[PDB]
């Protein structure tokens, strides 16, 4: 019936049925969990006690995380008339007696997530891992902050709740390895992006400074780098350069060539770089992901043999396909599958005795048969082959960005807080008031969660920028809205654009070579697979 | 990776030990609990926390330790 519970000692051929299973769907056991010799000790019962109760540990992460939109604002505590809504949102505000029966319940199911692998790691294997030293420190922040929120700076609660939520969900922690491997490439091409705007704002400073453009908008070199930054984005487009155009028609040729270069060469050759360093970092992760299951297939091999010499016999192979509980008959497998091995030793007439023989054997079975069964349109195809593939294949590359917009919201709730008021006077002349944005706001956490969406789409993105630079008075409010741009021209060109290209080229490959392999041979080849993936 | 002249080694807490002995080194104990074959059992092993009790009994030594691929003898 059920083969999940077997930390209670299985046979030497029956303890194989998990480690050979855990290479198929790619799960992970800890290299410390495999570090013990038996691999059936108390360190293995207490990993299957995790991944079975693993829904109390992942839906807690949203009970943790979505307490941010259901918080208060940071700062109606100084201010006057909260309950009169000065353009605020819609959600309720949890009171302090409602944030204590919801931060203890969140922090009763988070220490039990963090101080659980002490039931399968030691007092010193645990504390030397640094995606584990952090997540103990993040909780002691939340345990200090619950202590502070019980008996009474800038309140770094809601940044930790993102950071726990990144480290806890595996794929967001795995995505963030790419972005920290991609980052040294991206800051170079960012450092040549700035040199495009720094140069082209200097000629635009120089050329227009006497005339009617460079007295109206292009006043000084600060407000031409600033304007020519927003023309890079295209979103500022004729409104920058009308009073150069109205006075000489020839100055469009500067500006119809700058935004020609700025969008079609440079923006694509930021996209081409960030898609070049996505190809390298992804396959660097797949080759770090292969060994997470290839180590399994040296722990699979290394329980079959008795004396550890490095061999399997032929009947010793056949005795384990019955342990697979997948295929019906015994002798029709190895008589067929050894021919399916491209490089068989044939040292004996029966056995093939190497460890890299078995390392691809137990992976070829999981593709051809697919018969485990645990009891417990042609014209529009290649698009929706990809469009259905992509909905869980971008949830780690669109959950990083949602955890970048949940950092900037919490910054933006605090840097730009209850400022757009209906009591305010310097508000009502900005572009927020005339376009009537005047919501899309930054006062609540889901007022400003949506505002960052509009800034992310880049639909009229400078209305918020040019209006918050006037409400805070500085020029330093600019830097919130330039840094959002830069990170999400990594993130919205890396993790989203460059992925949807190479995800189309794989549901191109599973449609083009499906016709080719249907006419090439009767069964699966392993050398065409190794050559076809090394082409696009 | 430090020996001690009943022989001990140092420092990967319980399964990071091979224990060896004109001659090339002959292996004696893998894991400091498992006598390798062909050899009399007057040499035994024991993991004692952060010490590795390699063991002389009868009268008639290059302990080993890795973590991932880099391996640390004694001397």
């Amino acid at each position: 019936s059920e083969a999940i519970t077997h930390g209670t000692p299985f046979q030497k051929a029956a303890a194989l049925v998990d480690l050979a299973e855990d290479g198929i769907g790619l799960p992970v056991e800890i290299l410390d969990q495999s570090s013990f010799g038996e691999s059936a000790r108390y360190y293995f019962i207490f990993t299957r006690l995790d991944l079975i109760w693993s829904l109390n540990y992942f839906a807690l992460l949203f009970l943790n995380f979505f307490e941010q939109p259901l918080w208060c604002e940071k700062n109606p505590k100084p201010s006057c008339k909260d309950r009169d809504y000065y353009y605020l949102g819609e959600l309720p505000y949890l009171t302090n007696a409602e944030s204590i029966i919801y931060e203890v319940i969140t922090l009763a199911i988070l220490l039990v997530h963090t101080f659980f692998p002490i039931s399968y790691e030691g007092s010193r294997i645990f504390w030397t891992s640094r995606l584990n030293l952090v997540k103990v420190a993040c909780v002691v922040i939340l345990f200090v902050d619950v202590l502070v929120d019980f008996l009474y700076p800038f309140r770094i609660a809601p940044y930790v709740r993102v950071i726990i939520f990144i480290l806890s969900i595996r794929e967001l922690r795995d995505t963030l390895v790419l972005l920290s491997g991609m980052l040294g490439t991206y800051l170079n091409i960012l450092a040549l992006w700035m040199l495009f705007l720094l140069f082209a704002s200097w000629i635009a400073f120089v050329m227009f400074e006497n005339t009617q453009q460079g007295l109206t908008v292009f006043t000084s070199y600060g407000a031409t780098l600033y304007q020519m930054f927003i023309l890079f984005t295209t979103s500022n487009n004729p409104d920058v350069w009308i009073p150069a155009y109205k006075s000489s028609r020839w100055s469009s040729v500067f500006f119809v060539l700058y935004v020609l270069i700025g969008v079609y060469f440079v923006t694509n050759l930021i996209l081409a770089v960030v898609y070049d360093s996505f190809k390298e970092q992804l396959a660097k992760q797949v080759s770090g992901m292969d060994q997470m299951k290839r180590r399994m297939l040296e722990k699979a091999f290394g329980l079959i043999d008795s004396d550890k010499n490095g061999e399997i016999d032929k009947n010793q192979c056949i005795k384990l396909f019955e342990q697979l509980t997948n295929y019906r008959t015994l002798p029709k497998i190895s008589k067929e599958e050894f021919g399916l091995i491209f490089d068989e030793l044939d040292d004996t007439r029966d056995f093939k005795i190497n460890k890299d023989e078995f390392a691809d054997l137990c992976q070829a079975i999981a593709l051809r048969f697919q018969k485990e069964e645990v009891p417990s349109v042609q014209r529009y195809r290649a698009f929706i082959a990809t469009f259905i593939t992509l909905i869980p294949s971008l949830m780690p590359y669109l959950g990083t960005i949602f955890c970048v917009l949940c950092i900037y919201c919490s910054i933006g709730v605090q840097v730009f807080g209850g400022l757009v008021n209906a009591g305010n006077k310097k508000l009502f002349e900005t572009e927020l008031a005339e376009d009537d944005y005047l919501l899309f706001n930054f006062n609540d956490y889901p007022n400003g969660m949506v505002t960052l969406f509009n800034l992310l789409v880049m639909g009229n993105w400078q209305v918020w920028m040019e209006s918050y630079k006037d409400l805070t008075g500085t020029w330093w409010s600019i830097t919130y809205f330039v840094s959002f741009y830069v990170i999400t021209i990594l993130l919205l060109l890396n993790l989203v654009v460059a992925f949807v290209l190479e995800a189309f080229f794989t549901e191109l490959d599973l449609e083009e070579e499906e016709k080719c392999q249907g006419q090439d041979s009767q069964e699966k080849r392993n050398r065409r697979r190794s050559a076809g993936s090394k082409s696009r | 990776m430090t020996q001690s002249p009943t022989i001990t080694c140092r420092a990967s807490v319980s399964s990071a030990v091979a224990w060896y002995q004109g001659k090339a080194p002959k292996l004696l104990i893998y894991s400091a609990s498992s006598l390798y074959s062909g050899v009399p059992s007057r040499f035994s092993g024991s993991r004692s926390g952060t010490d590795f009790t390699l063991t002389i009994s009868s009268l008639q030594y290059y302990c080993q330790q890795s973590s991932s691929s880099l391996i640390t003898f004694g001397q």
Partner: nanobody, 114 residues
Framework: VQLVESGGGLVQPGGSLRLSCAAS????????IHWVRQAPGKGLEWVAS????????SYADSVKGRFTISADTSKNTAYLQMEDTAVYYC?????????????????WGQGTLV
Amino acid sequence: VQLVESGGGLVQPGGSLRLSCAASGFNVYSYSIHWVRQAPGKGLEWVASISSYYSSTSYADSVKGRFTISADTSKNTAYLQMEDTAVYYCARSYWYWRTSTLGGIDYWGQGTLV
């Protein structure tokens, strides 16, 4: 079956040699190789490892980048491109990742004088 090292000639400083680690007991992919040496009077020293299984050819701290290792599965030979006044040995751990504990390094070579 047991190990054969070759390539250990008479080396001058400056230039270097290229070793080889011959084998007949299926000693790549399964039983992978380790280069460990010993300068005279000293203890041993690990100088190069390899997986022909995992495709990882990794080696030490004090020789990192100096000494290059490669293989030949078809003749079961582990090459090694090279105060190195040493006596080189080969080795056959069954394990690769943590071969300290459970593999050991089972079969040691015959010896050389580099």
